[PDB]
Amino acid sequence: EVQLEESGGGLVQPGGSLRLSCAASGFNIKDTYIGWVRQAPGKGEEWVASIYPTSGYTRYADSVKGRFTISADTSKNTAYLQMNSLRAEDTAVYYCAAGSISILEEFDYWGQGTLVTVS
Ligand SMILES: C[As](C)(=O)[O-]
């Protein structure tokens, strides 16, 4: 009865920007941390960011600091990832994940992924 649904993926030119959304259902995101994890085809998982929506506290992987911004709209029970200055190395499936209040083994719920392709 819990779902995470990502959207916003697609094709982006190098240097471009993209905003992903993660709509949560079956729980209140204020009761959790929501995270974004990416994995390219043929490569391993990389956690990029987490947010605690009730407090606004955010955490970023060093590799995306400044370039990526994680946010939430608790009125829509939705988290977002703003990605700027995209490079080929950012090509990946981006998964939203959540856990009841940097590690991917601390998430209870996982989305379906949304594919981001940088030319
Ligand atoms: C969560 As961190 C990479 O800013 O110590």
Residue numbers in the entry: 2 to 102, 111 to 128
Direct quotes from the study:
Here, we describe a fragment-based method for the combinatorial design of antibody binding loops and their grafting onto antibody scaffolds. We designed and tested six single-domain antibodies targeting different epitopes on three antigens, including the receptor-binding domain of the SARS-CoV-2 spike protein. Biophysical characterization showed that all designs are stable and bind their intended targets with affinities in the nanomolar range without in vitro affinity maturation. Therefore, single-domain antibodies targeting HSA may provide a tool for enhancing the half-life of biologics.
Two of the three anti-HSA single-domain antibodies, DesAb-HSA-P1 and DesAb-HSA-P2, consisted in designed CDR motifs grafted in place of the CDR3 of a previously characterized single-domain antibody scaffold highly amenable to CDR3 substitutions. The crystal structure of DesAb-HSA-P1 in the unbound form further confirms the correct folding of the VH domain. A highly dynamic CDR3 loop was expected for this scaffold. The highly dynamic nature of this loop likely stems from the lack of strong CDR3-framework contacts, which is why folding and stability of this scaffold have been shown to be insensitive to mutations in its CDR3 loop by several studies. We selected this scaffold precisely because it can harbor virtually any sequence in its CDR3 without marked consequences on its stability. However, the dynamic nature of the loop harboring the designed motifs likely also explains why we were unable to obtain a crystal structure of DesAb-HSA-P1 bound to HSA. We speculate that this dynamic loop, even when bound to the antigen, retains enough hinge flexibility to embody the resulting complex with a degree of dynamics unsuitable for structural determination. In the absence of an atomic-level structural characterization of the designed interaction, we resorted to epitope binning through competition experiments. BLI competition experiments show that DesAb-HSA-P1 and DesAb-HSA-D3 compete with each other for binding to HSA, as the binding of one is hindered by the presence of the other antigen-bound DesAb. Conversely, DesAb-HSA-P2 does not compete with the other two, as its binding is not affected by the presence or absence of other antigen-bound DesAbs. This competition behavior is fully compatible with the rational design, as DesAb-HSA-D3 and DesAb-HSA-P1 were designed to target partly overlapping epitopes, while DesAb-HSA-P2 targets a different epitope on the opposite side of the antigen.
